[PDB]
Write an enzyme that holds these catalytic residues in place. Structure first.
Site, PDB file in Angstrom:
ATOM      1  N   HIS A 250      -1.925  -3.474   9.559  1.00 59.24           N
ATOM      2  CA  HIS A 250      -1.361  -4.155   8.395  1.00 59.24           C
ATOM      3  C   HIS A 250      -1.838  -5.599   8.306  1.00 59.24           C
ATOM      4  O   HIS A 250      -2.234  -6.070   7.233  1.00 59.24           O
ATOM      5  CB  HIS A 250       0.165  -4.102   8.446  1.00 59.24           C
TER       6      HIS A 250
ATOM      7  N   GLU B   7       4.348  14.598  -0.275  1.00 59.50           N
ATOM      8  CA  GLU B   7       3.341  14.407  -1.314  1.00 59.50           C
ATOM      9  C   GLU B   7       3.839  14.893  -2.669  1.00 59.50           C
ATOM     10  O   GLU B   7       3.692  14.195  -3.678  1.00 59.50           O
ATOM     11  CB  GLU B   7       2.041  15.120  -0.934  1.00 59.50           C
TER      12      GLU B   7
HETATM   13 ZN   LIG Z   1       4.098   9.846  -1.614  1.00 67.81          ZN
END
Ligand SMILES: [Zn+2]
Ligand SMILES: *[C@@H]1O[C@H](CO)[C@@H](O)[C@H](O)[C@H]1NC(C)=O
Ligand SMILES: *[C@@H]1O[C@H](CO)[C@@H](O)[C@H](O)[C@H]1NC(C)=O
Ligand SMILES: *[C@@H]1O[C@H](CO)[C@@H](O)[C@H](O)[C@H]1NC(C)=O
Ligand SMILES: *[C@@H]1O[C@H](CO)[C@@H](O)[C@H](O)[C@H]1NC(C)=O
Ligand SMILES: [Cl-]
Lengths: 49, 597
Positions: B487, B357
Site C-alpha cells: 500500500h 465478485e
Molecule cells: Zn468486489
C-alpha cells in the site's frame, strides 16, 4: 443530433419502427372501404345474402 | 442567469462524454486483462491517457466556476471531487519530480529482489519466492533471514526517497487546504452540508482511538494465546512475557496471521470446514457456482442478473492461448455493461471469492441511476464490506446444508465453532491492530511530529506497544522497514481494512436482526430474508450521493461506528481465551528482544 444504434444495447435502446394511422369519421363520401373478407357462395338455399 | 443552471448543464455535458469515455477505457482494460498482447497494452495506455486528459480538461473548465454556495447535494460534491486534482496543483516541474519519485519507489518495491548469499545469481522476487517461503517454510532461521533480506535490500534505497515523497505529499495537501496528506485522505470521510449528521476530520481519529481502545483486550488475549502456542512450538525463541518476533506472526510484515492457524488450532484432529470433495463428487462446474450464487441473492431479496453479464463475463480459466491475470476482478464498464474476470477452480476459496465478485457487481448495479461522479461508494470501505458480509453469510455451514453442498451429519459442535472463530480472528481481527499501527505511523509522519532521524525510532517502540512485536534485528536509519508494504509503495490508503471490518460487522448484525435470527451471530444466515435484503439495498442504492453516516443509519441505525457487533460475534472466543489463559501472563513486554540477552 446523432441518432445511431448498436446491437449490444439492451431492452429499451434497440431501434424500433413505429407507424401511425390518422382516420376521419366525419360524415363524408366514403373512399377507403373494407371487403369484409369473404364467404363461400351458397346456392339454392334460403340464406342471408 | 446564475451559476446553478450553468454548473448543472456543464455537469450534464461531463456525464454525457464521460460515460462513453469510461466505456471505452473499461472495454480496453477488459480486452487487455483477458488477452495479454502488446496491442492490448497499447490500447489500455491510450484509453487511460485520453481519460486523464479529459479529466484535466474538465477540471480546467470547472475551475472558473465559483465556489459560492450551492447545496443541491450532487453538483457541489461533483465539483469538489473534480477540483481535488492533487498532483497538478503545484508547478509542472514539481509534478514531474513527484512522478519521478513515485516511479522510483514503485520500481524499487517491484524489483526489490533478494539473492541468496550462497548463490549471487539465484535471486527471488516478492512472488513467488518470499510468499512461498513464508507460507510453507516454518523454519525459524529461514524466516528470519527472509525478513532480514527483504527489509535490508530495499529500505536503504528508499529512505531519502520516502522522505521526499512525504515532503511532496505534505506540499500537495497544504496547497489544497489540508494540514497533511493524511488530512487529504480524511477528506473522503468528511461530512458537511447536512444538519444533524456532520462529521469532523478529527472525529475519525477520535473514533479510531476509541474503537482500538475497546478492541485492545481482544488483541491482548489473542496475542497471548499465539505466544503460548508458538513457545510450545519454539521453546528457546519466545519469551513468556516478551513480544513475538516479526517473522513469527504468520506473514512477513504483520498484515495477516493466517499461517499461524495450523500451528494454533485448538483441536486439529477435528475436521476443518472444506467441501471441495463434495462439489467434485457432484460434478459441479463454475457456471453452477455462479448460478447458485445468483439463486442465493434471489433468496435474500435481489433480482436476477441480465443475459448481458452471462454473455460477456468469463467465469473460468481461458488458458495460455490468450493469457490473463487470474486475480478475480469486477467491472462496471458503463452503459449497463457488467463483467467479471475469475479463473474458477472447484474450491471453497473460489466459491467465497465468486460471491464477493458477483455481489460486488450487484453493489455496483445498485447505484446505476446515480451520475458518473456519484458512481462510487459513500466511503472507501463499503464495496469490500458488502463482499465480505456476503462471503461470511454464504460461508455458514447451514447455508450449505440447505442447498446440499455438505452432508447434513456435520453436527456443529463447540470445537468447530471455536476453530472457525479463531480462523476469523487470525484472518480478519488479526489485521486490525497492525493496520491501526501502520496508519497511525503514517499519520504522525505526514503531520510532521516524527523527526526523520527518529522515524523507526518511534515505530519499533510502538510496535512493542500496539502490535506487541519487537524487531528481531537492529536497523539503523538507512533501512525503511515501516514503508516495506504494497500500500505504501503503490500510493494507496490503509485505513480501508479497519473501516471495512467495522462496517461489515455492523452490516451483518443489522441484517441478522432484520432476518429474525436466533442464537450466536456466527450461525446467522440471510437466505430467504427479503426484508434484510431490501434494508441493505436501501444503503446500496444510495452510493456516494449522500453522506456515509446517513447510509449507515439506514441499515444499522447507529450514527457513529462501534465495536458492539464485534463483541457479540466473538464472545465465545473471548470466553474460551479467558478460560485458557488463567495461568499465563496477559500482555507483552517492550524490553525483551531476541537480539539482546
Ligand atoms: Zn468486489
Ligand atoms: C488478442 O490480441 C491479439 C493481438 O493484440 C489479437 O490479434 C486478437 O484478435 C485478440 N483476441 C480477441 C479475441 O480479440
Ligand atoms: C437537485 O438537482 C436535481 C437535478 O436537477 C433535481 O432533480 C433536484 O430536485 C434538486 N434538488 C433540490 C432539493 O432542488
Ligand atoms: C429474471 O426474472 C424474470 C422474472 O420472471 C424473468 O422474466 C427473466 O427471464 C429472468 N432472467 C433470467 C436471465 O433468468
Ligand atoms: C429457502 O427457500 C427455498 C425455497 O422455498 C428452499 O429450497 C431453501 O431450502 C430455503 N433455505 C433455507 C435456509 O431455509
Ligand atoms: Cl515494518
Amino acid at each position: 443530433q446523432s441518432y445511431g444504434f448498436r446491437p449490444t444495447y439492451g431492452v429499451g435502446h434497440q431501434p424500433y419502427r413505429v407507424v401511425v394511422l390518422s382516420f376521419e369519421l366525419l360524415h363524408a363520401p366514403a373512399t377507403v372501404c373494407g371487403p369484409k373478407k369473404s364467404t363461400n357462395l351458397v346456392k339454392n338455399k334460403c340464406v342471408n345474402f | 442567469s446564475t451559476i446553478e443552471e450553468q454548473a448543472k448543464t456543464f455537469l450534464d455535458k461531463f456525464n454525457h462524454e464521460a460515460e462513453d469515455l469510461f466505456y471505452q477505457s473499461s472495454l480496453a482494460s477488459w480486452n487487455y486483462n483477458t488477452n495479454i498482447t502488446e496491442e492490448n497494452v497499447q490500447n489500455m495506455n491510450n484509453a487511460g491517457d485520453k481519460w486523464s486528459a479529459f479529466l484535466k480538461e474538465q477540471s480546467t473548465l470547472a475551475q472558473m466556476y465559483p465556489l459560492q454556495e450551492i447545496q443541491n447535494l450532487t453538483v457541489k460534491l461533483q465539483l469538489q471531487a473534480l477540483q481535488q486534482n492533487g498532483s497538478s496543483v503545484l508547478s509542472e516541474d514539481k509534478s514531474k519530480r513527484l512522478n519521478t519519485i513515485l516511479n522510483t519507489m514503485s520500481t524499487i518495491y517491484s524489483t526489490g529482489k533478494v539473492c541468496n548469499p550462497d548463490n549471487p545469481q539465484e535471486c527471488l522476487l516478492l512472488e513467488p519466492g518470499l510468499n512461498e517461503i513464508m507460507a510453507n517454510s516454518l523454519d525459524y532461521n529461514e524466516r528470519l533471514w527472509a525478513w532480514e533480506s527483504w527489509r535490508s535490500e530495499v529500505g536503504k534505497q528508499l529512505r531519502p526517497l520516502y522522505e521526499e515523497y512525504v515532503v511532496l505529499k505534505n506540499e500537495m495537501a497544504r496547497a489544497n487546504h489540508y494540514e497533511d496528506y493524511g488530512d487529504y485522505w480524511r477528506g473522503d470521510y468528511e461530512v458537511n452540508g447536512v444538519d444533524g449528521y456532520d462529521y469532523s476530520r478529527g472525529q475519525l481519529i477520535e473514533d479510531v482511538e476509541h474503537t482500538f481502545e475497546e478492541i485492545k483486550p481482544l488483541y491482548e488475549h489473542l496475542h497471548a494465546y499465539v505466544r503460548a502456542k508458538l513457545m510450545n512450538a519454539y521453546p528457546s525463541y519466545i519469551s513468556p512475557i516478551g513480544c513475538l518476533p516479526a517473522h513469527l506472526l504468520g506473514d512477513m510484515w504483520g498484515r495477516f496471521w493466517t499461517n499461524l492457524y495450523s500451528l494454533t488450532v485448538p483441536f486439529g484432529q477435528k475436521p476443518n470446514i472444506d467441501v471441495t470433495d463434495a462439489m467434485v463428487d457432484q460434478a459441479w462446474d463454475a457456471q453452477r457456482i455462479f448460478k447458485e450464487a445468483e439463486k442465493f441473492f434471489v433468496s435474500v431479496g435481489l433480482p436476477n442478473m441480465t443475459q448481458g453479464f452471462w454473455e460477456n463475463s468469463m467465469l473460468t480459466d481461458p488458458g495460455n492461448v490468450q493469457k490473463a491475470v487470474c486475480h478475480p476482478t469486477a467491472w462496471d464498464l458503463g452503459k449497463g455493461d457488467f463483467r467479471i474476470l475469475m479463473c474458477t477452480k472447484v474450491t471453497m476459496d473460489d466459491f467465497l471469492t465468486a460471491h464477493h465478485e458477483m455481489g460486488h457487481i450487484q453493489y455496483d448495479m445498485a447505484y446505476a441511476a446515480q451520475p458518473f461522479l456519484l458512481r462510487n461508494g459513500a466511503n472507501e470501505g463499503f464495496h469490500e464490506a458488502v463482499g465480505e458480509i456476503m462471503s461470511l453469510s454464504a460461508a455458514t455451514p447451514k447455508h450449505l446444508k440447505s442447498i446440499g453442498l455438505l452432508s447434513p451429519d456435520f453436527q456443529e459442535d463447540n470445537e468447530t465453532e471455536i476453530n472457525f472463530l479463531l480462523k476469523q480472528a487470525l484472518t480478519i481481527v488479526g489485521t486490525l491492530p497492525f493496520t491501526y499501527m501502520l496508519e497511525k505511523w503514517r499519520w504522525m509522519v505526514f503531520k510532521g511530529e516524527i523527526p526523520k532521524d527518529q522515524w523507526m525510532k518511534k515505530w519499533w517502540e510502538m510496535k512493542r506497544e500496539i502490535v506487541g512485536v519487537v524487531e528481531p534485528v537492529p536497523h539503523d536509519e538507512t533501512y525503511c522497514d515501516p514503508a516495506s508494504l504494497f500500500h505504501v509503495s503503490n500510493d494507496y490508503s490503509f485505513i480501508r481494512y479497519y473501516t471495512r471490518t467495522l462496517y461489515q460487522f455492523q452490516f451483518q448484525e443489522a441484517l441478522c436482526q432484520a432476518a429474525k435470527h436466533e442464537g450466536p451471530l456466527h450461525k446467522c444466515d440471510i437466505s430467504n430474508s427479503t426484508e434484510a435484503g431490501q434494508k441493505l439495498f436501501n444503503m446500496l442504492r444510495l452510493g456516494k450521493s449522500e453522506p456515509w453516516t446517513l447510509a449507515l443509519e439506514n441499515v444499522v441505525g447507529a450514527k457513529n461506528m462501534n465495536v458492539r457487533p464485534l463483541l457479540n460475534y466473538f464472545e465465545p472466543l473471548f470466553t474460551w481465551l479467558k478460560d485458557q489463559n488463567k495461568n499465563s501472563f496477559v500482555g507483552w513486554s517492550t524490553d525483551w528482544s531476541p537480539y539482546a540477552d
